[PDB]
Amino acid sequence: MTLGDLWKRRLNNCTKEEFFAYRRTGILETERDKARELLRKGETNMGLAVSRGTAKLAWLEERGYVNLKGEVVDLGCGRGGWSYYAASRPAVMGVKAYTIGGKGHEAPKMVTSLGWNLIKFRAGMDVFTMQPHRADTVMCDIGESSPDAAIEGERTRKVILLMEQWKNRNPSASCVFKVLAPYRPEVIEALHRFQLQWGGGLVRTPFSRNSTHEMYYSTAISGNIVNSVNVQSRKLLARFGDQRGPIRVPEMDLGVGTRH
Ligand SMILES: C[n+]1cn([C@@H]2O[C@H](COP(=O)(O)OP(=O)(O)OP(=O)(O)OC[C@H]3O[C@@H](n4cnc5c(N)ncnc54)[C@H](O)[C@@H]3O)[C@@H](O)[C@H]2O)c2nc(N)[nH]c(=O)c21
Ligand SMILES: Nc1ncnc2c1ncn2[C@@H]1O[C@H](CSCC[C@H](N)C(=O)O)[C@@H](O)[C@H]1O
Structure with a gap:
């Protein structure tokens, strides 16, 4: 059992x-x-x-932790x-988005x-059985939380396997993906194998709530994975009992308009 496994049990x-x-x-x-409100006022x-x-994603980009460019798949x-964030970046030429x-x-x-x-949106599409196609940047923000940590690990393993499939198709692609439960041993194994072939490492964004262990993997960074995970698990376990509230910041506003 890992430190993150204990964090999950203490959370529950x-x-x-x-x-x-x-x-x-x-x-x-x-x-x-x-x-x-704008969103559900239909504006x-x-x-x-x-x-x-x-x-x-903006934080990852502005930190230099992801390379968003060329043909992007979401x-x-x-x-x-x-x-929408990717489409707003000048280095991005197009976005094929699937959900x-x-x-x-x-x-x-x-x-x-x-x-x-x-952006070409395609709803009704299961990405886990979709044939991979050409991409310069592959992003995947999939990982549904579950009170069952074993379910979170399996959800996470599926994402990593998907990223291996897209990398097989696009060995040079930049990758950024959610790792919902990075503390699960079966996830650590699959991430270490990913890292040994393709490089990369894990980072915690400051917007993630303490009720999730999610970290983001990107081929543009590095770092021992077990250390990254354990540092994060310790920080999450140390916040139990903390009284400070959240820190409110302005929402991202990308502006409106076309890009040609
Ligand atoms: C609502 N909730 C979530 N968690 C924990 O936080 C993790 C993810 O955090 P989140 O669930 O709040 O985030 P999300 O984006 O899903 O939003 P939401 O608040 O609507 O959460 C609903 C989920 O929490 C689960 N849940 C509901 N009540 C509990 C509970 N009492 N204990 C554990 N899980 C719960 C539901 O089955 C559902 O999966 C969950 O996987 C669970 O371990 C909770 N723990 C306690 N101790 N009491 C809770 O009320 C609780
Ligand atoms: N098998 C699957 N194929 C496609 N989409 C899936 C999927 N499983 C889950 N999803 C979708 O993956 C999405 C991840 S939500 C990610 C948030 C998003 N990056 C944003 O900035 O708004 C969810 O809407 C979920 O419905």
Whole structure:
């Protein structure tokens, strides 16, 4: 059993009050007061982020931890916060965004955020059985949380296997993907094998809530994986009992318009 496995059990052992107090303590949180209503008021001319995903990818890019360029695929695009972020980048030429949709799964939010015309959205698409195609940048933000850590590890393993498939098709592609449960031994094994072939490493974004162990893997960084995981597990376990709230920051606003 790992330190992260214990973090999960301690998380699930929280009372409701301890859970609410823990989940957002000390994390960055974008201010979505305007964004949120605009989206369900059906306003489509808006460049405010369609989800909390946009600020996470932006942070990775602005830190120099991901290379977004050329033809991008967004695997599991959901509402599309990563797709819109990618489309707004000048080095990005196009975005092919795929998501399953249906019951309990977000469909793409349709807005005129800068570069929207470079995105081809395909809902109803299962990326795990999709044939990989040409891509310069492969992104995947898939990983549904479960109170069962063994289910989280299996969900995570599936993402890593998917990224191996896309790398087999595109050995030179830049990759960035969610690693929902990096503390599971079966995940560590698959990540170490990924890293030995393709390089890369793991990083924690400051917007992730403490109720998730999610870390992001990218071929543009490096670092011992077990150390990265254990450092994060210790930091998560140290926040139990912390009273500070979240730190509110402005939401990303990419502006509106086409890119040609
Ligand atoms: C709601 N919730 C979530 N977690 C833990 O946080 C992890 C992910 O964090 P999140 O679940 O809050 O994030 P998400 O984006 O999914 O939003 P939401 O708040 O709607 O969470 C719903 C999920 O939590 C699960 N859940 C609901 N109640 C509990 C609970 N009492 N204990 C554990 N899991 C719970 C539900 O089955 C569902 O899977 C969950 O996998 C679980 O270990 C909780 N732990 C306690 N101790 N009490 C909780 O109320 C609780
Ligand atoms: N097998 C699958 N094929 C395609 N999409 C899937 C999938 N399994 C889960 N998904 C979708 O993957 C999405 C991940 S949500 C990621 C947030 C997104 N990057 C943003 O910035 O808004 C979810 O909407 C989920 O419905």
